[PDB]
C-alpha cells in the first residue's frame, strides 16, 4: 500500500571489527527494493523529534517510497563499542553503507541527510568510496573539525562550544551505560551547572583541568584542549582535502549565525565543480532556527522552512537516487536569506558572481576607542598615519554577544552590541549614515596592521549594522591568534613592538545595510567564551593559571603606509 | 516483535453524518489487541514534528505496545467535510472513539494526549460518555473557549490570539483545498503580513471588518468578534460545567506564561475530586517552551522536559489503560516550576494547601503614576483617602509586553516592563525592597475601587517582580471590562463618576520574590493587543471606528474606606 510503512527497532549491524551498531529501519510498503536514506546520530536514534525539526519532515520520504535508516553511533545508546567523537565514523559509515547495499530492500541507491553531527558524519561517509552512495545533504556541518566547531581559521579554541557539547554528550554517555552508578545523580547536577553557566565553566584556569568532563569524555582534553595546533591528530579526521576529488551531489544548508557557517560554505565551494551542489543559507544560529531574536526579528519567512526543505530534499533525492532527470527543474543552485531587506533570494553561485571585494579603510581623528571615539570607515585610504592603543587584560576579556556562539547564549546571533561599546578595548570604526543601500553578501575578512607589547596575543574583528534607533546588530566576526598568523600548523611567536600585517577570517554574511544605517567594525583582542582568551605569554594557553597570564598593550596602525581595512563583498544590484 | 510497529496512512473513518475523517494508525507488533491513544489535530496529522516537541516522545508509547491514532479534524487536510472551529469536535470525537473501540486491534482501553487544540479536543471527547475512554492528558488547553483563548474572565477579546490563529489556520485551509486557486499566492502573502504584525492587524477599525480572514474563515467574525458576551453560542461549545460530573483521570499540563493557564488550572480543580488528576506547570509561553527569554532565563531544568513528560504519561496510561495499580508509585499529584528559586517542586494539591490569601493594599504619598511615583504596596490598610487619576486614550493603549501573549511577541512571557514605566497611564505600586523571601504560588486577583468619566472602560492589573538590577519582570495579569464587572453574560453600563468595587482575575503564578527584590503591581486601562481596546463609549466595541471612540479619565481610589488591593496567594515554607 502506497504511503504505508513499517518500523523495525534495534536491528544490529556488524562493523568490520565485530562491534554491532543499532539501527532503526523505516521501510515503505513496496513490491521490490527501494532507495535508502541513512542518518547517523549520537543523540539516540529513537529520539527523532529532538533533531528532525532542524532538518526535514522526513516521514514524507518514507510515505513516498524511500527507506530511512537511523543509526546510533558507536558506543552510544543501543550500539555496542566505545564512543570517541569523529574517529570511528568514516569506517563505521563505510561498513553501514555496505550493509544497507546488501539488503533485500535496498535498490542500490543510498543517500544521507541531517544536521550538525548528523551532517559531519555525511562528509565522513562521502569519502568512503562506496559507489552506492549517490547524494548527501549535510546541514549546519563541517568537513574540517579543527576549523569548525572546535577551533577556527584563526587558531583560537572555541571553548564554549567544546565545554557545552561535552556536557551534553556527558548527559548521553551516562544515560547510555549498563547500570545506574551511585555518582550519576551528582554528575547530572554538575553537567547541568556547566550548561547553565558555560562562560563560568570556561573561566576556570588552567583550562585543561576538567575533572568532570575529562573523566566522562577524556577526548575533551586528550584530543581537543591538548592539540591547539592544526596537527596530524586533526588532519586524520579532516575530510576537506578529499572533497575536491569527490563527484557526489550535496545539498548543503548553513546559517549566518551558525558556528559552522564558514566551513559549511567552504564545502559547497569544494564540491560544486564536480557534482550537483545546492546551497541554502538562512539567518539562523545552531539552536535558534526561529528567525526571532531579542533585538532583531527577520520575519516569519525566516523561520526554518521545514516543508520547503522537505520538498527540496525529496526533489534532490529523486534526481540523484531515482534518476528522475527533471526532478530539480526550477530549483535554484543557491538560495540565501538576505538580511536587512529580510528576504529570500535565489542566486546562481556562491560566492556570488560579480562580488566586488572592496576595502573599507580604518581612519578617523583622535582615538577610535569606544563607540563615541572618532573611528571611521571609508573606501578611501586614510590620509594621516595614526594608531589606536588599548590594554587587553585576560582577566577582563570582551564578552561574547551573539555571533556564532553555540552553547553559551547561542540563541541571539544578531545581538545588540551596545552593552560593550563603552569599553576602552573595543575600537569602533563606522561609515557615515548611508543614503543608499549597500549590500554585503559573501565571505568577509580584515587586513590589520597590528603590534603588541606581548610575544603572542589575539586580534578580533566584528562587522555590525547600526540601526537608526541605535541598535548595533552583530553580523559576522573572526579572530586571529598571532602565533598562527601565517599557519595553523607551525606557529611562531611575534616580536614585541614590531608591526605585522595580519588577516582575520570573519566567515560570511548576507546583509543589505539600508538607508539610515551605518556599517561598523569593532576591533579588539578577545571575544570570550566564543574563543578562549589569549594569555599574552607565548605559552601553552590552556595550561596557564590566570595569575600567570599577562596584560598586553595592543595597537592598531592605520594610515597611508599601514592601510588597515575590512574587505567587504559588495553586491550592486540595479 | 516487541518494539516494532507499522504505520497505515489515510484510513478513512465515517462519522454519523457519512463524512469521513482521515486517520493514521501507528500499531505495534503484538499478538492481540492493545490499548490505544487518540490525537485530534487541525494542523495535518502527517506533520508530527510540528507539535510533538511540545508534548511527548510518543513513539515510545508505540514501541511499548500502545497503538496511536492521529486524526485530521473535519474539513482539513485529508479529511472530508467543512472546517469550523470547535463545533463538530464533540460529535466527531465520540464517533472516532466508537470506531476505535470496534477495531480488532483495540483492547477496549483508549486514552488521549496532546497540546493546545489537541488538548481542547480531549475535553470535548471526555464529555462523550464513551466508557472506553479511560484517561486524557490535555496540555496547554481549556474547557471553556470563551474564557480561554478567545475572550477571558474579564470579558475582553483576546484579539491578537484570534487574528494570529485565524491567519495560521488560513494558511492551512488554503493548503487543504482541492486545487490551487489564482488568489492563493496573494492570500498567502497577506496572511504572512498579519503574522509579522499582529498588533497592526488588530489596530484596524472597525475591528469586525476583516476582509481576508472573514473570507477564509467566516467564524472569526460570525462567532468570535460578533459574540462579545459569554452567550448561548459560547455555552454550546463550553465543556466546563460538565467536567464536575466526569470521573475521567486527566494529566493536565500548563505554563505560567501560557494563554490557557487560568483555564488549564481550573480544569484540574474541576476534576480532581472524582478521578486521578495530575498537574504539571512550567514557566512556558505557548510558543516558547525553552525556559529562555530576552531578559529572564529559568535554567536548563526549565526547558520543557520532554523525556520526563513521556515517562510520566506512560506511567499514567499504564495505570489507567493497562490497570497496573502501582504504575504511578512515586509520581507527585502536582509538580510546579517555582520561579525565582527557579526549581521544580512537588505538591499534594492545587491550590496549595495552606495558601494564605493575603491582601496587599495600594497606598502612597502623592500620585502613583509612573514607576517614579509614590505608589506603595503593604499588608496594612492605607491610612489616608487618596486617588490616582489618568487619561486612557484608545488611540494610545498601553502596549502588551510578555504575559500570556499567544501570537504577537508570544515568546517573551517574563518581559521587562521598564519600557512602559514612564507612561502616565501606568500606575505603579511596590513594596519596599525585601529582606526575606516571599513566595506567591496560587491564583491571583485584585479588588479595585474605580471610577470613570465614561459609561464603560477597562481596568488592568499586572504583578511584577522587580530585580536588583532594575528589570521589572512580568508575572501575571488580568483585565476587567467594566460592563462585565458582575457577569460575562448580562452586561450593564456604569454611571460616570460613581465608585465601583471590581475584581480583576489575574490568572495564576508561582514565584519566590527573593531578598533584594520588590513586589510590584501596575494598574492601567489597556493592554493591547493581548486584549482589544475599550472604546469608552458603551457601544459595540468591535464595530466602532477609532474616531468614534472616546478618551476616559479613570481613577483608582485607595484608603481606609476604599481599600483597593491585590490578593496574593502567600506560601510560607520554613
Ligand atoms: C551538532 O550535533 O552540534 C554540535 C555543536 S558543537 C556539533 C558537534 S560536531 O554537532
Ligand atoms: C492551539 O493549537 O493553539 C491555539 C492558540 S490560540 C489554540 C486554539 S484553541 O490551540
Ligand atoms: Cl569500540
Ligand atoms: Cl568507565
Ligand atoms: Cl528587527
Ligand atoms: Cl522572502
Ligand atoms: Cl609610543
Ligand atoms: Cl612597518
Ligand atoms: Cl461538514
Ligand atoms: Cl470557498
Ligand atoms: Cl535571569
Ligand atoms: Cl529543578
Ligand atoms: Cl475631582
Ligand atoms: Cl463610595
From Swiss-Prot, chains A, B:
It is found in: Cytoplasm. Keywords: Cytoplasm, Hydrolase, Serine esterase. It catalyses: cocaine + H2O = ecgonine methyl ester + benzoate + H(+). It comes from the Bacteria. This is Cocaine esterase. Optimum pH is 9.0. This enzyme hydrolyzes cocaine faster than any other known cocaine esterase. Incorporating disulfide bonds between cysteine residues substituted at Gly-3 and Ser-9 conveys significant improvements to the thermostability and the half-life at 37 degrees Celsius. Moreover, in combination with T172R/G173Q mutations, the disulfide-stabilized dimer (CCRQ-CocE) remains more than 90% active for longer than 40 days at 37 degrees Celsius, representing a >4700-fold improvement over wt-CocE. The enhanced stability serves as a better substrate for modification, with polyethylene glycol (PEG) moieties providing the therapeutic with stealth properties. Changing residue 54 to A/E: Decrease in activity. The keyword Signal does not apply. The active site is at 116 (acyl-ester intermediate), 258 (charge relay system), 286 (charge relay system). Its main location: cytoplasm. Residues 1-143 are annotated as: 1A. It consists of three domains: domain 1 contains the active site; domains 2 and 3 are involved in substrate recognition. Domain 1 contains the GxSxxG motif found in most members of the alpha/beta hydrolase superfamily. PANTHER family: COCE_NOND FAMILY, PUTATIVE (AFU_ORTHOLOGUE AFUA_7G00600)-RELATED (PTHR43056:SF10), PEPTIDASE S9 PROLYL OLIGOPEPTIDASE (PTHR43056). It is an enzyme of class 3 (hydrolase). It holds the Pfam family Peptidase_S15. Is relatively unstable at physiological temperatures since it displays a half-life of 13 minutes in rat plasma at 37 degrees Celsius. Because of the high catalytic proficiency of CocE, it is an attractive candidate for novel protein-based therapies for cocaine overdose, as this cocaine-degrading enzyme could be used for rapid cocaine detoxification in an emergency setting. However, wild-type CocE is relatively unstable, but this can be improved by specific mutations. Thus, improved stability of engineered CocE enzymes will have a profound influence on the use of this protein to combat cocaine-induced toxicity and addiction in humans. Also has a potential as a highly-sensitive drug detector. The keyword DNA-binding does not apply. It comes from Rhodococcus sp. (strain MB1 Bresler). GO terms for molecular function: carboxylic ester hydrolase activity; dipeptidyl-peptidase activity.
Amino acid at each position: 500500500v502506497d504511503g504505508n510503512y513499517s518500523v523495525a527497532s534495534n536491528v544490529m549491524v556488524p562493523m568490520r571489527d565485530g562491534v554491532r551498531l543499532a539501527v532503526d529501519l523505516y521501510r515503505p510498503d513496496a513490491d521490490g527494493p527501494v532507495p535508502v536514506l541513512l542518518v547517523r546520530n549520537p543523540y539516540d536514534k529513537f529520539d527523532v523529534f529532538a533533531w528532525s525539526t532542524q532538518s526535514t519532515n522526513w516521514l514524507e520520504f518514507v510515505r513516498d517510497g524511500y527507506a530511512v535508516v537511523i543509526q546510533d553511533t558507536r558506543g552510544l545508546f543501543a550500539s555496542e563499542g566505545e564512543f570517541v567523537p569523529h574517529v570511528d565514523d568514516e569506517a563505521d559509515a563505510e561498513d553501514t553503507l555496505s550493509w544497507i547495499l546488501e539488503q533485500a530492500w535496498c535498490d542500490g541507491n543510498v543517500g544521507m541527510f541531517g544536521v550538525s553531527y548528523l551532517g559531519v558524519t555525511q562528509w565522513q561517509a562521502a569519502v568512503s568510496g562506496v559507489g552506492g552512495l549517490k547524494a548527501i545533504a549535510p546541514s549546519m556541518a563541517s568537513a574540517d573539525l579543527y576549523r569548525a566547531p572546535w577551533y577556527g581559521p584563526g587558531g583560537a579554541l572555541s571553548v564554549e562550544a567544546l565545554l557545552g557539547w561535552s556536557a551534553l554528550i556527558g548527559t548521553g554517555l551516562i544515560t547510555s551505560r549498563s547500570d545506574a552508578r551511585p555518582e550519576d545523580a551528582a554528575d547530572f547536577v554538575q553537567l547541568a551547572a556547566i550548561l547553565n553557566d558555560v562562560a563560568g565553566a570556561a573561566s576556570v584556569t588552567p583550562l585543561a583541568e576538567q575533572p568532570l568532563l575529562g573523566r566522562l569524555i577524556p577526548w575533551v582534553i586528550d584530543q581537543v584542549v591538548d592539540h591547539p595546533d592544526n596537527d596530524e591528530s586533526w588532519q586524520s579526521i579532516s575530510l576537506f582535502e578529499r572533497l575536491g576529488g569527490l563527484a557526489t551531489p550535496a545539498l548543503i544548508t548553513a546559517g549566518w549565525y551558525d558556528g559552522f557557517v564558514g566551513e559549511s560554505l567552504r564545502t559547497f565551494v569544494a564540491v560544486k565543480d564536480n557534482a550537483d551542489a545546492r546551497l541554502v543559507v538562512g539567518p539562523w544560529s545552531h539552536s535558534n532556527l526561529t528567525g526571532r531574536n531579542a533585538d532583531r526579528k527577520f520575519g516569519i519567512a525566516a523561520t526554518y522552512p521545514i516543508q520547503e526543505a522537505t520538498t527540496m530534499h525529496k526533489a534532490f533525492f529523486d534526481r540523484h537516487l531515482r534518476g528522475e532527470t527533471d526532478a530539480l527543474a526550477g530549483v535554484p543552485k543557491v538560495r540565501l536569506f538576505v538580511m536587512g531587506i529580510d528576504e529570500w533570494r535565489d542566486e546562481t553561485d556562491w560566492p556570488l558572481p560579480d562580488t566586488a571585494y572592496t576595502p573599507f579603510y580604518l581612519g578617523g581623528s583622535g582615538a577610535a576607542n569606544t563607540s563615541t571615539g572618532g573611528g571611521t570607515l571609508s573606501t578611501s585610504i586614510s590620509g594621516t598615519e595614526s594608531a589606536d592603543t588599548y590594554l587587553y587584560d585576560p582577566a577582563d576579556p570582551v564578552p561574547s554577544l551573539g555571533g556564532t556562539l553555540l552553547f553559551h547564549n547561542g540563541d541571539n546571533g544578531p545581538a545588540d552590541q551596545r552593552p560593550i561599546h563603552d569599553r576602552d578595548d573595543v575600537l569602533c570604526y563606522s561609515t557615515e549614515v548611508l543614503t543608499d543601500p549597500v549590500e554585503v553578501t559573501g565571505t568577509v575578512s580584515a587586513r590589520l596592521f597590528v603590534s603588541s607589547s606581548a610575544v603572542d596575543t589575539d586580534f578580533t574583528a566584528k562587522l555590525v549594522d547600526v540601526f537608526p534607533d541605535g541598535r548595533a546588530i552583530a553580523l559576522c566576526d573572526g579572530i586571529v591568534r598571532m602565533r598562527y598568523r601565517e599557519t595553523l600548523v607551525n606557529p611562531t611567536l611575534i616580536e614585541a613592538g614590531e608591526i605585522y600585517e595580519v588577516a582575520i577570517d570573519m566567515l560570511a554574511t548576507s546583509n543589505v545595510f539600508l538607508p539610515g544605517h551605518r556599517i561598523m567594525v569593532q576591533v579588539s583582542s578577545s571575544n570570550f567564551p566564543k574563543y578562549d582568551r589569549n594569555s599574552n605569554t607565548g605559552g601553552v594557553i590552556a595550561r596557564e593559571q590566570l595569575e600567570e597570564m599577562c596584560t598586553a598593550v595592543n595597537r592598531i596602525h592605520r594610515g597611508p603606509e599601514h592601510p588597515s581595512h575590512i574587505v567587504l563583498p559588495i553586491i550592486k544590484r540595479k
